[PDB]
Amino acid sequence: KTGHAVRAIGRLSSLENVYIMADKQKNGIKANFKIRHNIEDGGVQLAYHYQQNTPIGDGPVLLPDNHYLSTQSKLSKDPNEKRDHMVLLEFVTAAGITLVSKGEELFTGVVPILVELDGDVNGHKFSVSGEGEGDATYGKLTLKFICTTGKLPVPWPTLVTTLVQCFSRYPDHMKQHDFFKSAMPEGYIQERTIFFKDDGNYKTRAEVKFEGDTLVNRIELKGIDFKEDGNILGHKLEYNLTEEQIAEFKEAFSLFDKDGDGTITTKELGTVMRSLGQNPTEAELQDMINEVDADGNGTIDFPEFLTMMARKMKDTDSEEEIREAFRVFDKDGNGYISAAELRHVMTN
């Protein structure tokens, strides 16, 4: 059962959020991050994102310290809709900094959203159209997307990140780091390249601005070098918790929180890893905690620990990640794990 504990450490060693830095050369920001698409019959497809945003207007913008965005997405179907479509529910929150603009005032209530995409992937063209609402106070998006060209030639999940980060909920201690809203109403250019592992890549250019009362995302997408047999063109990707597991998670939370005060410190996280033959520094342990530390108080409470495990249970890991999760039990590293190599890890 305490396999839960090993992947917790794997997750805390991973980088799963949307990382933002100021553009140190000009107004704007850069971002990079990783998406895991679950392959239908098991496996994972990874997509590496590299992102640049630049104001359209001349006025000043907020250039943030490094921090990140954290995401929850639910994709569904509308049972009374016959066109190729996607209903999306999304929560996005900023974090990563422990312990303001004009355009920010445009986001205090529910804002209507229009989304317009023209795409071309390996010569298969398509258009997508989206409408819905954004609630920045809760980092909440609700949208319906329609493929207006008939059938979509790529899986819907691969488009999500392309199809309005000015709707992120920035916590009160981080308001001065919201580049996205400060760029409004005139808005910003958002550019990405997206690299599907062992496959093609998408390139995207988007204009994000207010047109009247409406926040508009207008996008061009060109995709090349895809395999007609790969997970994208071949439509191999999945479309989208028991309180039994919540019991299994609080029990795995106790293994770290040895003094049971409801929170995990760098002190306690260090103990567990050292009993698994690792030796992380104080700076590493703070960085590990900071990746899943929603409130920025430097400790992982149980809400914060749940979110990370719900997300980790949602996503299949790659082989390079299961490899390392495997070589924690196999001490001699021979391919076959002995029931003695288990007990060592177990006791610890």
Q: CA-CA distance, 37 to 49, in Å (whole number)?
A: 13
Which region among 2-10, 53-61, 223-231, 326-334 touches Ca ion (by CB under 5 A)? Answer: 326-334
CB of residue 261 to Ca ion, shortest distance in Å: 4
Helices within 80-139 (DSSP H only): none
The long-range contacts involving 21-26, CB below 8 angstroms and separated by at least 24 positions, are 21/64, 21/66, 22/63, 22/64, 22/65, 22/179, 23/52, 23/54, 23/63, 26/54
Which region among 43-51, 106-114, 213-221, 260-268 touches Ca ion (by CB under 5 A)? Answer: 260-268
Can you tell me which residue has the tokens 């039994």? 244
Can you tell me which residue has the tokens 């479509």? 85
CB of residue 293 to Ca ion, shortest distance in Å: 5
CB of residue 243 to Ca ion, shortest distance in Å: 23
Binding mask 281-300 for Ca ion (x = CB under 5 A): ------------x-x-x---
HSE-up of residue 292 (Cα within 13 Å, Cβ side) = 29
Nearer to Ca ion, 17 or 263 (CB): 263
Establish whether 315 is an annotated binding residue.
Answer: no
Looking at residue 80, what DSSP letter applies? T
Six-digit token string for 232: 């994208």
Over its C-alpha atoms, the chain yields an Rg (Å, rounded) of 22
Would you count residue 306 as binding Ca ion (CB under 5 A)?
A: no
Establish whether 116 is an annotated binding residue.
Answer: no
CB of residue 290 to Ca ion, shortest distance in Å: 10
CB of residue 34 to Ca ion, shortest distance in Å: 23
Q: CA-CA distance, 70 to 291, in Å (whole number)?
A: 9
Choice from 199, 257, 291, 317 touching Ca ion (CB under 5 A): 257
HSE-up of residue 176 (Cα within 13 Å, Cβ side) = 3
E-assigned strands of 61-105? 67-76, 85-95
Nearer to Ca ion, 99 or 283 (CB): 99
Choice from 78, 259, 282, 319 touching Ca ion (CB under 5 A): 259
CB of residue 173 to Ca ion, shortest distance in Å: 12
Establish whether 317 is an annotated binding residue.
Answer: no
Burial class (CB in 10 A: 0-12, 13-18, 19+), 191: middle
142, β-bridge pairs: 89, 133
CB of residue 193 to Ca ion, shortest distance in Å: 34
Choice from 98, 108, 137, 338 touching Ca ion (CB under 5 A): 338
Residues sharing a CB contact under 8 Å with residue 225, sequence separation 6 or more, in sequence order? 122, 199, 200, 201
Which region among 7-15, 157-165, 255-263, 269-277 touches Ca ion (by CB under 5 A)? Answer: 255-263
Check if the beta carbon of residue 146 is closer than 8 Å to that of residue 165.
no
* # chain residues binding Ca ion, by CB under 5 A: 10
Nearer to Ca ion, 198 or 261 (CB): 261
Choice from 65, 78, 261, 282 touching Ca ion (CB under 5 A): 261
The residues binding Ca ion (CB under 5 A) are: 257, 259, 261, 263, 293, 295, 297, 330, 334, 338
Binding-site annotation: residue ranges for Ca(2+): 257, 259, 261, 263, 268, 293, 295, 297, 299, 304, 330, 332, 334, 336, 341
